Ligand binder design. Structure first.
Ligand SMILES: NC(=O)C1=CN([C@@H]2O[C@H](COP(=O)(O)OP(=O)(O)OC[C@H]3O[C@@H](n4cnc5c(N)ncnc54)[C@H](O)[C@@H]3O)[C@@H](O)[C@H]2O)C=CC1
Ligand SMILES: NC(=O)C1=CN([C@@H]2O[C@H](COP(=O)(O)OP(=O)(O)OC[C@H]3O[C@@H](n4cnc5c(N)ncnc54)[C@H](O)[C@@H]3O)[C@@H](O)[C@H]2O)C=CC1
Ligand SMILES: O=CNC1CCCCC1
Ligand SMILES: O=CNC1CCCCC1
Ligand SMILES: [Zn+2]
Ligand SMILES: [Zn+2]
Ligand SMILES: [Zn+2]
Ligand SMILES: [Zn+2]
Lengths: 374, 374
């Protein structure tokens, strides 16, 4: 009784940067060709959403943000073949068109049809499906999950197992998969290795989980919020260090702790100084440093290229290096086979209409992931 | 009639930067325990030698430079077990102690006994075996091959096949092996890939050889000296471009030619701007960029970390990543098996007394490698 109709729902609308989300009435157009309209079930509060509010990440405004979520398909567009109404799905902020050079490449997963390099904030067709107060609203990374109903392109949605728990697997839409894959797929952490993880948020804890499952012997967590240390050790960190506790830059301390440098370091914060510090603290002849955190907009860092000439490898990745549409259903199956845990990451559960409050939990440091439920 | 005696011979002493080499008479102390004294037969002129003369690379002065070379063992010290008097050898500007954390690592080659991170300009015991005009002279990278005789620590010398032509395998002491390994061992160039090589000197041409040996489909050479293009195509380049011919930045031209970025790029010059350019011109989701050139001393570059977050890999290496003492004798055997060619790299052959004109052949852009014979 909704298929082909404009839907009546409510969504968290951002009107200007640095302002709270305005819960308002929105009009969600029905799906066009190769498009999917999804009833939302559960969505996470990711730091990347906050970067939109802070201006750290620049996308066209006004927008409905949100990108870490899982729901039920409400209706399908002309030509849709991968999902039907009633399937559980997870929208993909990194699409997998399957037709570009990156999708055919064995390693790449940053599909060229992505809306992240030059943000337009539209569907693949360049228009918007969202109307609030009669004005057109931008999409976010082709997902826009801060809504009871959203519409996504087919290449930005993955059908997942019909028995999966939606309040937990929504993190496979971003936080967990990014951190987990950064360790096991991007850095490719080895057995018996020593790792250093900068940032103990949701992504950073997932990096720790991946390092441990990869068989690392030492995992050093680094965070200026010592309240994060308990859960970091819970998921696998062997030690935690607070840079504010030392009179030396943390890279010397880490280099001394690791008897000459760690095998793998991860920057999971999004600051220029910690990216160079993370690179410096891995072993100069064979260390690998992976940038996961997002720096603010337009920022050049400074580094001495002698740090690389000695033998270091420096790399980054989106979404833990996973080809999104292929990997997400597999990761959900893995979760159901209890191959990894997601509950350590969920620190509270709130109803969706209280999106704004749950955000201040993130920026005040009490939370890892808050799950907004619908 | 020399074993155990001070030898008095010719040496090219460099007393200060930006001035010619002073060909003179020096006193070469006999080897102490675990040291080897070598009669030099052939030495190549590497750009890294020129960097000490220009101050680009700072090592203690006065010095006997040279590090790309081959000779015959004159005598060995007490305890030497790997070489004997009469052996053909190549001194290793990167040692292989075999005992440090890096030597034990499967992938690393930058042995912690190197004299490159913190140059002392001495033997491993901290003293010098060179005396010239009253003064003790500094060693260079534990090799100092611009001398009739040098003394090197055992961990810095490799025994090679006795049927080797020293006038041509000396390039395995640096130039060839550095470029070749940067492609086949560090980048791991794949078959059918497109590569970009910045800098078409001896090291850069060896990168091209490695890319071709690795089965690259396109190899784009980049040099502002268009006289380098012929010999580059000879050893495998499919295309060459001169940045001075373009109005738009060369990485734009290269991304352009490669339909979105190359698979592998190599900086083999030693300039900060070209290292950033080489990185930018590889494909943003899965490109790999390798720094081979040495920048001027203590200089930072500036770059946008978003270039890595999309999926690029940025790394460097000393000596093409080869474990020196293990690889040099095996590379010589490969040359002896005609598995690779060194002739393309040798453009001039001069006697050691004309060291200064061979340096001027390099600085004028006329030569690739000049081989000095004693
Ligand atoms: N590459 C990708 O695909 C993705 C990147 N990200 C980015 O990774 C970062 C983390 O995401 P979340 O875990 O959700 O964020 P978070 O904000 O929850 O955790 C970040 C941690 O960094 C700590 N921190 C802040 N400044 C620090 C400093 N100077 N030194 C040490 N620790 C410091 C904080 O105490 C905090 O605990 C963000 O930049 C996010 O935008 C997030 C998802 C996907
Ligand atoms: N990483 C390692 O283990 C080693 C590093 N090196 C360094 O590699 C670099 C190259 O070594 P060589 O081939 O022997 O030097 P080279 O001087 O023989 O070749 C350098 C090439 O760079 C070209 N060039 C200079 N400026 C350029 C620019 N803006 N754009 C494009 N091309 C430019 C020059 O025309 C020249 O052909 C040097 O920095 C050398 O010190 C050398 C041996 C080992
Ligand atoms: O967190 C989800 N997506 C992020 C990925 C890194 C760049 C900013 C957007
Ligand atoms: O060319 C030989 N050795 C070089 C290696 C890179 C640092 C400077 C010295
Ligand atoms: Zn996210
Ligand atoms: Zn694609
Ligand atoms: Zn050299
Ligand atoms: Zn060693």
């Amino acid at each position: 009784s909704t298929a082909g109709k404009v839907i009546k729902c409510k969504a968290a609308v951002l009107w200007e940067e640095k302002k709270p989300f305005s819960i308002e009435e929105v009009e969600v157009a029905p799906p066009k060709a190769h498009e999917v309209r999804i009833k939302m079930v559960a969505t996470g509060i990711c730091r990347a959403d906050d970067h939109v509010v802070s201006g750290t990440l620049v996308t066209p405004l006004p927008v409905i943000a949100g990108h870490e979520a899982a729901g039920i398909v409400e209706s399908i567009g002309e030509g849709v073949t991968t999902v039907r109404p009633g399937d559980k799905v997870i929208p993909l902020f990194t699409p997998q068109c399957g037709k570009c050079r990156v999708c055919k490449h064995p390693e790449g997963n940053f599909c060229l049809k992505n809306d992240l390099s030059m943000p337009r904030g539209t569907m693949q067709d360049g228009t918007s499906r969202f109307t609030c107060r009669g004005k057109p609203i931008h999409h976010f990374l082709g997902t826009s999950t801060f809504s009871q109903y959203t519409v996504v392109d087919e290449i930005s949605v993955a059908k997942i197992d019909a028995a999966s728990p939606l309040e937990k697997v929504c993190l496979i839409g971003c936080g967990f998969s990014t951190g987990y894959g950064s360790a096991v797929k991007v850095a490719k952490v080895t057995q018996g290795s020593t790792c250093a993880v900068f940032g103990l948020g949701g992504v950073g804890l997932s990096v720790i989980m991946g390092c441990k499952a990869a068989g690392a012997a030492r995992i050093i967590g680094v965070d200026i919020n010592k309240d994060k240390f308990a859960k970091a050790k819970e998921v696998g960190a062997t030690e935690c260090v607070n840079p504010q506790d030392y009179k030396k830059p943390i890279q010397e301390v880490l280099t001394e702790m690791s008897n000459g440098g760690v095998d793998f370091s991860f920057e999971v914060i999004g600051r220029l100084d910690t990216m160079v510090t993370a690179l410096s603290c891995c072993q100069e002849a064979y260390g690998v440093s992976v940038i996961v955190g997002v720096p603010p907009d337009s920022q050049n860092l400074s580094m001495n290229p002698m740090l690389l000439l000695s033998g270091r490898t420096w790399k980054g990745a989106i979404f833990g290096g996973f080809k999104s549409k292929d990997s997400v259903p597999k990761l959900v199956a893995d979760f159901m086979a209890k191959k990894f845990a997601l509950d350590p990451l969920i620190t509270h559960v709130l109803p969706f209409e209280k999106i704004n409050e749950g955000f201040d939990l993130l920026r005040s440091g009490e939370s890892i992931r808050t799950i907004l439920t619908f």
